[PDB]
């Protein structure tokens, strides 16, 4: 099924190198890079979702990033991926990008945010394609022989390649709480909150409207958004929802590994 | 040109007159484009890929693109015992030195 | 002690005798206060005064 | 080509998790103690020990 992306949404995750040399939480964290195509094509999985938007519908001109609590739209025209030099993207649908890439010891993927910032994530990655045949050639000639190889085919089909989805963990946010003097109030920007304190608090729990916790000191207060009605990929580098795992669901990841001649 | 401190602007000498241009069109590249990481007045910080040359350039108000190129062998020294290319998720902290991003005196 | 000079008369480097708005009340002459001495430690405070201006709205 | 499969890490605040041991082709799991992970907008756990 192709329109699974009504159910599941983009996210922030911890990127090791946000282009400036510092690690930070990024809309563009790349979770896996895979290079099984002997033709040297590269399949990249990213925390964006592309080919769709907010108001959950396919749109080949857009992608959606997570603007911390709310999914938000940006133009596909300003997605990029580069290695030692610019790659040409050969397909993008959902979490997945195909690229054709020059040899390089890094992969950096990025986009322009709706507020005209540029965001990227950079991983160490030794991209050096295998040679097909007996000549270390650089780009295909207008005359030659054909040899067997393999490619991530440019089709967004039901591939029988599957990735699992889970609901988010409770998302913490220090701005859900304010010290009104002598008490702390939990405040609710229309997402249901879980909260906990140890200020003699007998009544930790949940709310869908603003609440006061009496005697409370903001250091001894904790709050997180909890009723997520959308799912995520169950990546490393975001917490699991519970010890048991979670209630699942799947996505068929596009671009299957066809055999073909080069 | 009016000495106002607009972050989005830069000024250059058009013959006898200071003249303005857009910050977003300043670039520095070596073998490939460098991430600028700070600028003020005459100075730029950049993080650059390895390369045997350096060029800085900007687009003029009159849409023409200026650049300047020097030979400059850049190959930054290793930290620790591995010739790595970009920082990992997992590793060890080692002491090194950096141009701090703050424009302090 | 430390001090600064108006090419002849001498004063403590908190301000030049022209006072704030200096570069707009003795234009370019303001910079010659730094020509014939900049070797004494106080001269960055003369620079701090010389290139600071006090328009009608200011109220510290 | 092997695939290494890694689910989201379970982090428990304020108490020890324990190894939910299972037979899978080269399975491994480990419990790391005294973590204090941050999400984008705050610490995930309540306490820092």
């Amino acid at each position, epitope marked *: 099924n192709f329109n699974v992306y009504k159910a599941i949404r983009p996210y*922030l995750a911890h990127c090791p190198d*946000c282009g*400036e040399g*510092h*690690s*930070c*939480h*990024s809309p563009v964290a790349l979770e896996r890079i895979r290079n099984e195509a002997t033709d040297g094509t590269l399949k990249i999985q990213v925390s964006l979702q592309i080919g769709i938007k907010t108001d959950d519908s396919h749109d080949w001109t857009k992608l959606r990033y997570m*603007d*911390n*609590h*709310m999914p938000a739209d940006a133009e596909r025209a300003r997605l990029f991926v580069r290695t030692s030099a610019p790659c040409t993207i050969t397909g993008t649908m959902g979490h997945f990008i195909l690229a054709r890439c020059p040899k390089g010891e890094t992969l950096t993927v990025g986009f322009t945010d*709706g*507020r*005209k*910032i*540029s*965001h990227s994530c950079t991983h160490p990655f030794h991209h050096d394609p295998p040679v097909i045949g007996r000549e270390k050639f650089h780009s295909r000639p207008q005359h030659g022989r054909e040899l067997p190889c393999s490619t991530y085919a440019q089709s967004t089909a039901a591939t029988a390649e599957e990735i699992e989805v889970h609901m988010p963990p409770d998302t913490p946010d*220090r*701005t859900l709480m*304010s*010290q009104q*003097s002598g008490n702390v*109030k939990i*405040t609710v920007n229309s997402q249901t909150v879980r909260y906990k304190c140890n200020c003699g608090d007998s009544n930790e729990g949940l709310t869908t409207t603003d609440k006061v916790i009496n005697n409370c*000191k*903001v*250091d*001894q207060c904790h709050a997180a958004v909890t009723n997520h009605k959308k799912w995520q990929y169950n990546s490393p580098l975001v917490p699991r929802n519970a010890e048991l795992g979670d209630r699942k669901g799947k996505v068929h990841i596009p671009f299957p590994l066809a055999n073909v001649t080069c | 040109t*009016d000495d*106002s*401190h*607009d*972050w*989005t*602007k830069l000024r250059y000498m058009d013959n006898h007159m200071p003249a303005d241009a857009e*910050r977003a069109r300043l670039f520095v590249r070596t073998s490939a484009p460098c*991430t*600028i990481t*700070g*600028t*003020m007045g005459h100075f730029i910080l950049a993080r650059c890929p390895k390369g045997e040359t350096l060029t800085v350039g900007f687009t003029d108000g009159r849409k023409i693109s200026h650049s300047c190129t020097h030979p400059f062998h850049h190959d930054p020294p290793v930290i620790g015992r591995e010739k790595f290319h970009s920082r990992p998720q997992h590793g060890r902290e080692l002491p090194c030195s950096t141009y*701090a*991003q*703050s*424009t*302090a005196a | 002690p430390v001090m600064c000079l108006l090419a002849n008369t001498t004063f403590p480097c908190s301000q030049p005798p022209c006072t704030p708005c200096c570069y707009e009340k003795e234009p370019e002459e303001t910079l010659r206060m730094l020509e014939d001495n900049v070797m004494r430690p106080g001269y960055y405070q003369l620079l701090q005064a010389s290139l*600071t*201006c*006090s*328009p009608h*709205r*200011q*109220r*510290r | 080509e092997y695939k290494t499969v890694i689910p989201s890490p379970y982090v428990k605040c304020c108490g020890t998790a324990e190894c939910k041991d299972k037979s899978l082709p080269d399975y491994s799991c480990k419990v790391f103690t005294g973590v204090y992970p*941050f999400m*984008w*907008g*705050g*610490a995930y756990c309540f306490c820092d020990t």
Partner: antibody
Amino acid sequence: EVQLVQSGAEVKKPGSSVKVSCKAFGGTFSSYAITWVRQAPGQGLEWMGGIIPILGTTDYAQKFQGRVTITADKSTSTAYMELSSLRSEDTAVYYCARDPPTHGGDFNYYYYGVAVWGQGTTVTVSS
Amino acid sequence: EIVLTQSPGTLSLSPGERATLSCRASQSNNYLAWYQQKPGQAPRLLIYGASIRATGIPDRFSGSGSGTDFTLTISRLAPEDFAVYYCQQYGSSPLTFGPGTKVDIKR
């Protein structure tokens, strides 16, 4: 020195599009890293994400662009917001009277200076 | 990330005493700075930090810290020194404002 000036309070209806006033002075006579912070009553401070140092392009922080969907003026000292289609929950003091707020991701960095503060206009979402 | 955590949530002192405020973060790298709010009053700069420092009120304030946490101290509290006191480090990548510390001179 730098000095900031605003209108005392704005009497506004919910669902309107509203200018929020500023001019900046005090040692500059023209623009210098102007930005906004906005605080609803009983909240802690929050930098008004639509306006980090907007003096040649309009900002947003992460979050914002909900009902706080907003643009901000670059022009000489006159850092006006246009806060558009606001709601009752946006009743706050809007402190334009605020110091150079050095940004990032965006690759440039700013001085510490003398700093500046002051008043914050109460946009009084009321009927 | 970073998550500026002011360690004291609330304080009370006699006039004549010295207050000290502390803030904990995972890394710093650029100047976090201190500002305060008396109920209904306009803020002003107390102090800047991270490696250098500069301070806006004629000096009865000082600020310092490295390797763990960052601090502000007020020498001899006396007059209208009642406020909530905050520290912050501006926009950039997702990172938020400080939570604030209430302090005042005793009635």
